[PDB]
Amino acid sequence: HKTRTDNRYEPSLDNLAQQDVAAPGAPEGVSALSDAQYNEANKIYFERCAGCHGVLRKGATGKALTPDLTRDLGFDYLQSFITYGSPAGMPNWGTSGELSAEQVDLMANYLLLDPAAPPEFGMKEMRESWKVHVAPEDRPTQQENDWDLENLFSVTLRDAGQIALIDGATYEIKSVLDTGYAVHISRLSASGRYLFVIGRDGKVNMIDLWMKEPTTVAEIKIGSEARSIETSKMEGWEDKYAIAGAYWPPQYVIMDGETLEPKKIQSTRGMTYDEQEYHPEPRVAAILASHYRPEFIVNVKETGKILLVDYTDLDNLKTTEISAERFLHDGGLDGSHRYFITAANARNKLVVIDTKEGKLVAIEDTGGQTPHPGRGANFVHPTFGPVWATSHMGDDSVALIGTDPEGHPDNAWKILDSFPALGGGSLFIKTHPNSQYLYVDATLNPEAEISGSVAVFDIKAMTGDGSDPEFKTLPIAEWAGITEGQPRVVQGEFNKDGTEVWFSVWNGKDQESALVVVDDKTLELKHVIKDERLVTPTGKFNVYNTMTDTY
Amino acid sequence: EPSLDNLAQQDVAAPGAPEGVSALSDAQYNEANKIYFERCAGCHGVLRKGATGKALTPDLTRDLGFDYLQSFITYGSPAGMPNWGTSGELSAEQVDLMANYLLLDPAAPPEFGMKEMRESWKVHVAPEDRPTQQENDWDLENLFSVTLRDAGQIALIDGATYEIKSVLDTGYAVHISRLSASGRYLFVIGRDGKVNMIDLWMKEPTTVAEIKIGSEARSIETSKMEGWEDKYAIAGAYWPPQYVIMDGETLEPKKIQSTRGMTYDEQEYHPEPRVAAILASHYRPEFIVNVKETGKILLVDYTDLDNLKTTEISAERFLHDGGLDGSHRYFITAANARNKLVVIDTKEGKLVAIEDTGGQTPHPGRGANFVHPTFGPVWATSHMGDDSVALIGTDPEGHPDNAWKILDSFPALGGGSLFIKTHPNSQYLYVDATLNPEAEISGSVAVFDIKAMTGDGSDPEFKTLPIAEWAGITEGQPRVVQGEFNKDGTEVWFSVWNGKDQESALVVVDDKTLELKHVIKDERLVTPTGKFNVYNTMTDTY
Ligand code: DHE
Numbered sequence A: 001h002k003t004r005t006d007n008r009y010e011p012s013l014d015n016l017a018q019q020d021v022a023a024p025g026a027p028e029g030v031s032a033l034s035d036a037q038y039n040e041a042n043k044i045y046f047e048r049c050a051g052c053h054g055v056l057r058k059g060a061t062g063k064a065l066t067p068d069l070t071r072d073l074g075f076d077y078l079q080s081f082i083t084y085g086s087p088a089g090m091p092n093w094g095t096s097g098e099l100s101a102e103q104v105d106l107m108a109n110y111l112l113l114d115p116a117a118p119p120e121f122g123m124k125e126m127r128e129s130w131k132v133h134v135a136p137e138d139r140p141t142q143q144e145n146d147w148d149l150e151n152l153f154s155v156t157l158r159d160a161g162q163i164a165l166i167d168g169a170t171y172e173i174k175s176v177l178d179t180g181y182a183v184h185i186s187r188l189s190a191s192g193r194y195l196f197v198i199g200r201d202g203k204v205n206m207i208d209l210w211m212k213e214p215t216t217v218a219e220i221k222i223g224s225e226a227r228s229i230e231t232s233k234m235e236g237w238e239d240k241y242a243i244a245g246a247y248w249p250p251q252y253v254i255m256d257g258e259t260l261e262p263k264k265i266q267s268t269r270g271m272t273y274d275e276q277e278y279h280p281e282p283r284v285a286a287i288l289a290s291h292y293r294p295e296f297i298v299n300v301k302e303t304g305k306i307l308l309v310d311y312t313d314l315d316n317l318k319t320t321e322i323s324a325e326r327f328l329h330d331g332g333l334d335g336s337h338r339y340f341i342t343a344a345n346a347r348n349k350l351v352v353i354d355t356k357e358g359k360l361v362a363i364e365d366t367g368g369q370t371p372h373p374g375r376g377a378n379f380v381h382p383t384f385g386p387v388w389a390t391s392h393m394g395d396d397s398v399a400l401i402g403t404d405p406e407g408h409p410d411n412a413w414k415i416l417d418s419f420p421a422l423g424g425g426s427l428f429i430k431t432h433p434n435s436q437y438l439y440v441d442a443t444l445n446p447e448a449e450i451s452g453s454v455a456v457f458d459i460k461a462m463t464g465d466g467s468d469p470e471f472k473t474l475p476i477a478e479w480a481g482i483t484e485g486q487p488r489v490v491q492g493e494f495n496k497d498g499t500e501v502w503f504s505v506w507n508g509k510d511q512e513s514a515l516v517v518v519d520d521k522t523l524e525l526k527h528v529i530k531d532e533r534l535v536t537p538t539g540k541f542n543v544y545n546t547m548t549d550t551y
Numbered sequence B: 001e002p003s004l005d006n007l008a009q010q011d012v013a014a015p016g017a018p019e020g021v022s023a024l025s026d027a028q029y030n031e032a033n034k035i036y037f038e039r040c041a042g043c044h045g046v047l048r049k050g051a052t053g054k055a056l057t058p059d060l061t062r063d064l065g066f067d068y069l070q071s072f073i074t075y076g077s078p079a080g081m082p083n084w085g086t087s088g089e090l091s092a093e094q095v096d097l098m099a100n101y102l103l104l105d106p107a108a109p110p111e112f113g114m115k116e117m118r119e120s121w122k123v124h125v126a127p128e129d130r131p132t133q134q135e136n137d138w139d140l141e142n143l144f145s146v147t148l149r150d151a152g153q154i155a156l157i158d159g160a161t162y163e164i165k166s167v168l169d170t171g172y173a174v175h176i177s178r179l180s181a182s183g184r185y186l187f188v189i190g191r192d193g194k195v196n197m198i199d200l201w202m203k204e205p206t207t208v209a210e211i212k213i214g215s216e217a218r219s220i221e222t223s224k225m226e227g228w229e230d231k232y233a234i235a236g237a238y239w240p241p242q243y244v245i246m247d248g249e250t251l252e253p254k255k256i257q258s259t260r261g262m263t264y265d266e267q268e269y270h271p272e273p274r275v276a277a278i279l280a281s282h283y284r285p286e287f288i289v290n291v292k293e294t295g296k297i298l299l300v301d302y303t304d305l306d307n308l309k310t311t312e313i314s315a316e317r318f319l320h321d322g323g324l325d326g327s328h329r330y331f332i333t334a335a336n337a338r339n340k341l342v343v344i345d346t347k348e349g350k351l352v353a354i355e356d357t358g359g360q361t362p363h364p365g366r367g368a369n370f371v372h373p374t375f376g377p378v379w380a381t382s383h384m385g386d387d388s389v390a391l392i393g394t395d396p397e398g399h400p401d402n403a404w405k406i407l408d409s410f411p412a413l414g415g416g417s418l419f420i421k422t423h424p425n426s427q428y429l430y431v432d433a434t435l436n437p438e439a440e441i442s443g444s445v446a447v448f449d450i451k452a453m454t455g456d457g458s459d460p461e462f463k464t465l466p467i468a469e470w471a472g473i474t475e476g477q478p479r480v481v482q483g484e485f486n487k488d489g490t491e492v493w494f495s496v497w498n499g500k501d502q503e504s505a506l507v508v509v510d511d512k513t514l515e516l517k518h519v520i521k522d523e524r525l526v527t528p529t530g531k532f533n534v535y536n537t538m539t540d541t542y
């Protein structure tokens, strides 16, 4: 129950927490909570508890807290356990997990009551939220602005509920657009025309980059809590579909790539792969798109299943439900784009799927604590050959896995090396084919100087002799020149040419933030992006690198 | 509609009552709970989300109020809701208990996963210890496996001598018997979710393995793709909503799949999508699973249970029973409440047609395939809701215009039909009328002469066989049900189903002459229902 470096990246269901619930009746031996009391506790539960224990309390990373179990444990036991506080959430916006005496008692009582299941969100609800602002026929048939679309960066302005579209070469903010709250990620259609963003509240906006003044052409809500979205990337299926994944309800939705019409909703409720026990809250995590078959690649967290969803026929729906490892989160494709490599973070494993054959190929422990790759980093190691790398939230380690069964069979799907970077609390590792450098952030590190810096390894100097590769430390936050607070540096993203790498210098909503552009060839400061509209900059996605999965 | 009597034997704790609602004691609540599952959940759902009856969830019931609930439960209504109070079925006190129960928040019903299945899993005779060849002198292919419903037993009856070879104790009210593809293993599934596997090669055939797969179940099937003989068995449950693939030699539970999910049309989450009929493909190594409330037909590929390939086919809600056409390529199934037949191509794994039968509530069983003299290959179903028999063309290549179209519809004995039957060696089509209110009809079967069918629009005449009268049974309500042929297709058996404390029988009809051949009576023959001939079941010959 204490704040660790790798247990702050758990879902915070604060959109779902805004919903009012009814106070349930209490069985013998338990006292009922009033309307206000129950809602107050429920709000606290959804905000700072449901991530680990579930909205239904059936357990996720933390054990089940269902009434049968809690009543047997008792109030006193729960009261004393809960009085210590809960693990803090994410900086600049998460909770500290600090509850008072009034709050501690409420939570213990709440746990003894029978939880109601939050509302579902089906086709009826999605279609009511579905708005097409500019029908396809009224859109341009060619690019009508003079922007360099492929070198554009789509930047989340988290707490402002906006995104910024920034010129990759001039650093000019081309436009700031209103979207869903706290957009989690931006994704691009395969042609690079359409920009899709998903907010944590389940709101999806679709933006047409060919318009003289790009704006939202369609929107829809797919759930109450959502984090992922992806576009069809199989050759021949460019711009055909988009897919969104939600934490609640546990489901994914396949939408029309031009209009966002909801075409197919699939529940992810089901059995765990290992113990084969029903789980009523299997959250959708990362969603990728196959380059080998017309399929979406969907990580289902709590049941530990990777779904290969064939979008060629939504009525006679072909899926492959791959038993993998529980706690699947994020991942990426290898350099050849054939293998999906994903972190079952809580179990410290990397699951490898062959997207061509539709089957599990390997499961390997990284030797680190809580691997968090993002999409990861593919590069050619001088000794090992093609590798994919991940850093970790729980420790300072960077792990390399061999990704070339044909050319380097002895190294394929084995952890080939593990070495330290700046410190624990890393979120994102990054490289590019044109770069000789591997960048590693340390976003969640408790030490301000570490969290405001990035480690940079010289790939060319790597020998894989077992020693610890040296790294250069770039003082990104210092380069940005921010006086107030202790801004967190997060997520490297390259430009189209792979000559410059951008980092977010993420400060609070009413504090000063920036984007820092690094010249990859020299590792020197190229440019500092500051603007009054640049509020809480987090994720940044280069159009070309996102549409092509170049990482 | 289903009766979840097994789920009702569980004692649940009395839940809390929110403000404005009166609480029930543990005893009162438990009494109401048992009644709910035993008599109410079939139509209303275990979770009270509604199926054939309206939803009875607390948000809806509280708006209606106690008085409304009490009145509705007492006098019922014309639209399918029994008059529990005025009929005397439930005492006045029990009616009030149910009204109060409906206003309360029901605890979630127990799940039944791998741990629970493995705990119930018993292997009496390991495969290594079983015979390597048939060790009895029985003609196994001509053997009939007959449910003795209320006795929780089955009777293995010789197809030629009509001798009850053995009476075996199994799960309560076995719903169906199924045979492995080799004809060696006999699988039965009780309503309670209990599966028994019997080795017919033993000197004295008995259960070699058993397992429980849920709380309420109705379906079981074996792997029938060439090369996959005896490899797997699959069972389907009403509760929990799931299907389980088991090892075909030991019953080891290998893969459990939840059927909870979205309805095909309105795409809304449904928390209780019951598994109905389960068939086995002859074109691909797949099981064919009907999921009732969501209207999905699942094609589940058993070649790899870890990287599980399925095809979820959007069909029509209320899928129940069905069968393969004569070629064994197309699966034709009734979406009964919507009066539709859904046709799936098992080779291509896609929906091919959805057609209304023109009748009310088609109930085919596995149906009846035959070559109609003018229409070509057809598949027939009778109906529960009316006296009609419908024919659908099943030959897209050879009779294209007729394929997947209702080609003829004509009357049989009356409404309340459950099973229609024929055999390739027979020229007759037999149709029961089991649920008809008229005893004369309920104890008789209609027989149509396929050779005389001209498909000219006129209604084909039928002969009426007085099955119950032939059995010499008039006491109680002897309800004649389900024709089943012997291996050669020269005789047809019907069950004369009477109450457990009444006299029942099996009636064997000579298919050539349409005359009484033999009456099977025995004190052990309690409530005989389903009968399955080993050869006809293993080969899907119907
Ligand atoms: C499932 C998921 C993905 C994969 C998306 C995909 O495949 O399309 C993802 C990716 C991401 C990516 C993708 C980077 C990439 O290069 O692919 C980024 C930048 C990101 C920035 C943040 N994430 Fe993320 N993130 C969650 C979930 C996820 N984050 C959480 O449940 C969580 C932990 C808290 C929450 O309630 O949302 C969380 C907190 C954060 C942040 O506090 C971050 C740093 C900032 C923010 O804007 O909210 N997450």
Ligand code: DHE
Residues within 6 Å of the ligand: B001, B002, B003, B004, B147, B149, B173, B174, B175, B176, B191, B218, B219, B220, B221, B275, B276, B277, B278, B279, B320, B321, B365, B366, B481, B482, B529, B530, B531
């Ligand atoms: C899902 C299902 C199947 C398909 C099995 C398969 O594919 O393996 C089926 C088949 C059947 C079959 C298969 C016949 C065949 O030739 O395939 C028979 C004989 C049968 C005898 C009865 N069924 Fe059945 N039956 C139900 C369900 C089902 N019955 C019910 O939900 C229902 C309506 C009520 C109930 O609570 O069980 C019900 C009442 C009955 C009877 O009252 C019957 C007549 C007698 C009995 O023993 O309970 N059902």
Ligand code: HEC
Residues within 6 Å of the ligand: A001, A007, A008, A010, A044, A045, A048, A049, A050, A051, A052, A053, A061, A062, A063, A065, A073, A078, A081, A082, A085, A086, A087, A097, A107
């Ligand atoms: C993720 C970091 C957590 C958050 C946020 C909260 N809890 Fe938790 N809890 C977590 C763990 C890892 C564990 C230990 C057991 C395990 O799963 O390994 C727990 C345990 C509890 C308990 C103890 C119950 C028991 O059976 O001993 C309680 C009562 C509990 N958690 C309640 C709770 C509440 C009320 C929270 C909101 C503030 C909360 N937890 C947050 C992980 C995490």
Ligand code: HEC
Residues within 6 Å of the ligand: B001, B035, B036, B039, B040, B042, B043, B044, B052, B053, B054, B068, B069, B072, B073, B077, B078, B079, B080, B081, B082, B084, B098, B099, B102
């Ligand atoms: C299937 C034959 C049923 C069984 C067994 C029971 N009920 Fe029923 N119920 C059924 C239907 C088809 C309907 C719809 C209303 C109509 O006009 O027929 C109902 C309705 C109810 C209601 C009223 C709900 C409303 O009006 O919105 C109640 C309170 C109800 N049913 C309760 C109930 C109970 C307690 C039962 C067990 C004794 C029971 N029903 C059995 C169908 C069937």
